[PDB]
């Protein structure tokens, strides 16, 4: 809900 | 998915991949065929020794108690078909994609990711602490992670309620715990979180000691060797005090100089977590309020929890140790409630 920056990990 | 991995559960489940394998727990992803849901299943053989059953029971009770975004969700525990045929426990949980040890090992993380992961870890620690629960085994592999960076703590069987064993990895153990018989405390978890934050910055463990002695050398080489009687106020053991006195006199290391590209606010938070005196170490609530985490802090959305009494783990305080059968019944009671 507070992941304001749309942070992500490219995980496969 | 090694053929050697056998789960005695309903054929409605099809094992998919082996996620973890240790002496206590084996964790696999599995598809519940009737619904198509892919879940995680942690299998434990708790009955060869009371120690294993005690860890299983603490773990199950803590998982069932908490309903928090940063604590892994338990869906259910599989029901044995009879008490006589109850030899393993299968905990079904929400399936996460990976863990923070694998992430730190394989991904380059931005300062934004580091803020976000330590924020979530501390948010979990705050609710445990406000509930008078200390985890005692916080480390990257016990922090589960999804691709959207959601983080949830797991592995609660070494927890204790404030007021032969499995031993937490020495690399994340607070110095007062390693030194004295000190009554484990909230501060020991904050120390482990400081080791986790340092590991996020360095991409490797900050204090990878080979043994007790080397661990202390590595810790004091960074935080500085305690030397005045005030510095040693929290150490009662005369053996422990003399040992500290035999160490080289290290000053506290200038971390901002050693790691010049790390966010200075992050170094400041880290320094406040890796303090020798547990009474002076920052609390999880204060850490969530620290400038480094201002992007994510919300004082109205950081659950404080409610106190759990020591009797919740009453089975750990019996004059006469409970038998394996005694613990099998207590675990059965949790499965069917
Ligand atoms: N719900 C879960 N989803 C995905 N992976 C999980 C899950 N639970 C555990 N794992 C994986 O299994 C590993 C071991 O699980 P853990 O609960 O810490 O058991 P152990 O007590 O054997 O250390 C974790 O480090 C993680 O890689
Ligand atoms: Mg673990």
Q: What is the DSSP string of B114-178?
A: HHHHHHHHHHHHHHHHHTTEE-S---GGGEEE-TT--EEE---TT-EE--------GGG--HHHH
Q: Nearest by CB to B147, which of A4, A5, A9?
A: A9
- Whole-Å CA distances, B185 to B177, B240, B278, B279, B283: 9, 18, 8, 10, 11
Those residues with Cβ within 8 angstroms of residue B189's Cβ, 6 or more apart along the chain or in another chain: B125, B128, B129, B134, B135, B136, B138, B284
Cβ of B40: how many Cβ atoms within 10 Å?
A: 22
User: Rounded to the nearest 5°, which phi and psi values hold at B253?
Assistant: -70, 145
Mutation for testing the A interface, residue in B108, B116, B143, B302 having most A CBs under 10 Å? B116
> CB distance from A12 to chain B under 8 Å?
no
Secondary structure (3-state) at B329 = helix
Cβ of B118: how many Cβ atoms within 10 Å?
A: 28
Those residues with Cβ within 8 angstroms of residue B249's Cβ, 6 or more apart along the chain or in another chain: B225, B227
* Ligand closest to CA B72: 1
Give kind and range of the element (H or E) at residue B32.
Answer: strand B25-32
Residue whose token pair is 């003399």:
B242
Q: Distance, CA B24 to ligand 2 centroid (Å)?
A: 9
Partners of residue B89 on adjacent β-strands: B44
> CB distance from A7 to chain B under 8 Å?
yes
CB-based contact B296 A11, cutoff 8 Å: no
User: Rounded to the nearest 5°, which phi and psi values hold at B142?
Assistant: -100, 20
CB-based contact B112 A7, cutoff 8 Å: yes
CB of B74 within 6 A of ligand 1: the answer is no
CB-based contact A9 B296, cutoff 8 Å: no
Measured over the CA atoms of residue B168, residue B16, residue B42 and residue B118, the dihedral's sign is positive
Partners of residue B41 on adjacent β-strands: B28, B92
Fold of B1-95+323-337: Phosphorylase Kinase; domain 1 (3.30.200)
CA distance B138 to B152: 12
Burial class of B3 by CB neighbour count within 10 A (0 to 12, 13 to 18, 19+): exposed
Q: Nearest by CB to B107, which of A1, A2, A9?
A: A9
Which two three-digit tokens encode residue B193?
Answer: 């979180």
Which two three-digit tokens encode residue B297?
Answer: 């802090």
CA distance B151 to B167: 24
User: Rounded to the nearest 5°, which phi and psi values hold at B263?
Assistant: -50, 125
What is the per-residue DSSP string for B286-317? HHHTSGGGTTT--TTSS-------GGGGGGG-
CB of B137 within 6 A of ligand 1: the answer is no
Task: Give the experimental resolution in Å.
Answer: 1.5
Partners of residue B298 on adjacent β-strands: none
CB-based contact B112 A5, cutoff 8 Å: yes
Provide, for chain B, the percentages of residues in helix, strand and coil under a 3-state DSSP scheme, each rounded to the nearest 5: 40, 15, 45
- What determination technique applies here? X-ray
Catalytic residue list of B: 137
Which two three-digit tokens encode residue B180?
Answer: 């004295």
Q: If you count DSSP H runs as helices and E runs as strands, how many of each does chain A have, helices first?
A: 0, 0
Which two three-digit tokens encode residue B209?
Answer: 């000691």
Cβ of B125: how many Cβ atoms within 10 Å?
A: 26
CA distance B266 to B226: 24
Fold of B96-322: Transferase(Phosphotransferase); domain 1 (1.10.510)
The whole-angstrom distance between residue B245's C-alpha and the CA centroid of its chain comes to 31
Q: Contact B201/B266 with Cβ under 8 angstroms?
A: yes
Q: Nearest by CB to B98, which of A7, A8, A11?
A: A11
User: Rounded to the nearest 5°, which phi and psi values hold at B98?
Assistant: -165, -165
User: Rounded to the nearest 5°, which phi and psi values hold at B7?
Assistant: -115, 120
B262 a known binding residue? no
Residue spans of the domains in chain B: they are 1-95+323-337, 96-322
Partners of residue B42 on adjacent β-strands: B27, B91
Report the nearest-CA residue for atom 9 of ligand 1.
Answer: B27
């Amino acid at each position: 809900r507070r992941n304001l920056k749309g942070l992500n990990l490219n995980l496969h | 998915m090694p053929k050697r991995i056998v789960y005695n559960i309903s054929s409605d489940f099809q094992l998919k991949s082996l996620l973890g394998e240790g002496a206590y727990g084996v964790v696999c992803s599995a598809t519940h065929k009737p619904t198509g849901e892919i879940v995680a299943i942690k299998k434990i053989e708790p009955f060869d020794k009371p120690l294993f059953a005690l860890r299983t029971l603490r773990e199950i009770k803590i998982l069932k108690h908490f309903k928090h975004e940063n604590i892994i969700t338990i869906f259910n525990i599989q029901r044995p078909d009879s008490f006589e045929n109850f030899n393993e426990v299968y905990i079904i949980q929400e399936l996460m994609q990976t863990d923070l040890h694998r992430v730190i090992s394989t991904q380059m993380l931005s300062d934004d990711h580091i803020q976000y992961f330590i924020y979530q870890t501390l948010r979990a620690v705050k609710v445990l602490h406000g509930s008078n629960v200390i985890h005692r085994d916080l480390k990257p592999s016990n922090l589960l992670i999804n691709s959207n960076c959601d983080l949830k703590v797991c592995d609660f069987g070494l927890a204790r309620i404030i007021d032969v064993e499995f031993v937490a990895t020495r690399w994340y153990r607070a110095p007062e715990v390693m030194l004295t018989s000190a009554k484990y405390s909230r501060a020991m978890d904050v120390w482990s979180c400081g080791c986790i934050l340092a590991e996020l910055f360095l991409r490797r463990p900050i204090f990878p000691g080979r043994d007790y002695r080397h661990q202390l050398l590595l810790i004091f080489g960074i935080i500085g060797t305690p030397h005045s009687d005030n510095d040693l106020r929290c150490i009662e053991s005369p053996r422990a005090r003399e040992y500290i006195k035999s160490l080289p006199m290290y000053p506290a290391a200038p971390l901002e100089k050693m790691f010049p590209r790390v966010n200075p606010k992050g170094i400041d938070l880290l320094q406040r977590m890796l303090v020798f005196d547990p009474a002076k170490r920052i609390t999880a609530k204060e850490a969530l309020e620290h400038p480094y985490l201002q992007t994510y802090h919300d004082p109205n959305d950081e659950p404080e929890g409610e106190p759990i009494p020591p009797s919740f783990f009453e089975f750990d305080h019996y004059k006469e140790a409970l038998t394996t059968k005694d613990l099998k019944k207590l675990i059965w009671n949790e499965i069917f409630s």
